[PDB]
RNA sequence: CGUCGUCAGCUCGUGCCGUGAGGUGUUGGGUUAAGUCCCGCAACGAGCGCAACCCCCGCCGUUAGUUGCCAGCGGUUCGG
């Protein structure tokens, strides 16, 4: 909540090409063939975005974090592994929201196989199944790791790159689910309800924004949590 | 019942795409006898198939000696 001057590395955008003209309002200028985000409008939108986040958090709402850019995977896997908001990390399966019932059936199979490997029924029905179901539970935990926490449809979603995760954005629009997103120059701002005009490539921007967001979430529900152990993931 | 044909296929549920017939899934890369499996993917699963569970032939054991053997000894019209 004090990220005014500590925003080191967020103003960096993508190149001159691969941009979206609809983002021109959130751009300050172009330095050395690279779009640089407007520093003022960044916090201008951050006010309203974080205010919506606090309102939805203190009401007890669930937010789905979505990240697949391979630069925010290890960060989302723990910033959402804090206060119990679910997440999707490896890839966004088509129909996680519109076909939410079938994916919940997949989650049922996940916890069923978890109950099988907890019961003494592991050894019966010989080793063929002990390998098949082992690999099946492996991949189910690989994909539905954070998604298993959703019992109903989420009240909002959080996206790291709305261009790379455009399918989740589209499904959220279809179901009238608010779309919080960390938008860059390559993204369409109209599809994002609450926009965060920052960098989606640099690890520091993602760590800063997501850490402060989860800190605001836990601050809305009381019991301020220690700083997130995602700094060591700078590497 | 024969046949394409023991051929590797044909579909469905939900979601998504298209005004619509339809598509996606079932395409792709690797692999297999196989839509067999792996990886990827607006798809996620499922059914009839494939395969397996059935029978026979292959090695061994347990249970049982009106089939078998000087394996073992005795008798032998010396033919278990
Ligand atoms: K058209
Ligand atoms: K193939
Ligand atoms: Mg065959
Ligand atoms: Mg269909
Ligand atoms: Mg057409
Ligand atoms: Mg239609
Ligand atoms: Mg169809
Ligand atoms: Mg087809
Ligand atoms: Mg096709
Ligand atoms: Mg099959
Ligand atoms: Mg596929
Ligand atoms: Mg007899
Ligand atoms: Mg006998």
Swiss-Prot record:
GO terms for molecular function: rRNA binding; structural constituent of ribosome. Keywords: Coiled coil, Ribonucleoprotein, Ribosomal protein, RNA-binding, rRNA-binding. InterPro entries: Ribosomal_uS2 (IPR001865), Ribosomal_uS2_bac/mit/plastid (IPR005706), Ribosomal_uS2_CS (IPR018130), Ribosomal_uS2_flav_dom_sf (IPR023591). GO terms for biological process: translation. CDD domains: RPS2 (cd01425). Residues 99-144 form a coiled coil. It holds the Pfam family Ribosomal_S2. GO terms for cellular component: cytosolic small ribosomal subunit. Part of the 30S ribosomal subunit. Contacts protein S8 and may contact the N-terminus of Era. Belongs to the universal ribosomal protein uS2 family. Spans the head-body hinge region of the 30S subunit. Is loosely associated with the 30S subunit. This is Small ribosomal subunit protein uS2. It comes from Thermus thermophilus (strain ATCC 27634 / DSM 579 / HB8). The lineage of its organism: Bacteria, Thermotogati, Deinococcota, Deinococci, Thermales.
């Amino acid at each position: 909540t004090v990220k005014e001057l500590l925003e080191a590395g967020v103003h960096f955008g993508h190149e001159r090409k691969r941009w979206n003209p609809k983002f021109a309002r959130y751009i300050y200028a172009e330095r050395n063939g690279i779009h640089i985000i407007d520093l003022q409008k960044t916090m201008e939108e951050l006010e309203r975005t974080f205010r919506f986040i606090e309102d939805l958090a203190m009401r007890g709402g669930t937010i789905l974090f979505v990240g697949t850019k391979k630069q925010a995977q290890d960060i989302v896997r723990m910033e959402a592994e804090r206060a119990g908001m679910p997440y999707v990390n490896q890839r966004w399966l088509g129909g996680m929201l519109t076909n939410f019932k079938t994916i919940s059936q997949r989650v049922h199979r996940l916890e069923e196989l978890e109950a099988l490997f907890a019961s003494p029924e592991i050894e019966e029905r010989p080793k063929k199944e002990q390998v098949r179901l082992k690999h099946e539970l492996e991949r189910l935990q690989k994909y539905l790791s954070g998604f298993r926490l959703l019992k109903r449809l989420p009240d909002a979603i959080f996206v790291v790159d709305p261009t790379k995760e455009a399918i989740a954005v589209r499904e959220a629009r279809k179901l009238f689910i608010p779309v919080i997103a960390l938008a860059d120059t390559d993204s369409d701002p109209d599809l994002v309800d609450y926009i965060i005009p920052g960098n989606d490539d640099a690890i520091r921007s993602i760590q800063l924004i997501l850490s402060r967001a989860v800190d605001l979430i836990i601050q809305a529900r009381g019991g301020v949590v220690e700083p997130s152990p995602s700094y060591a993931l700078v590497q």
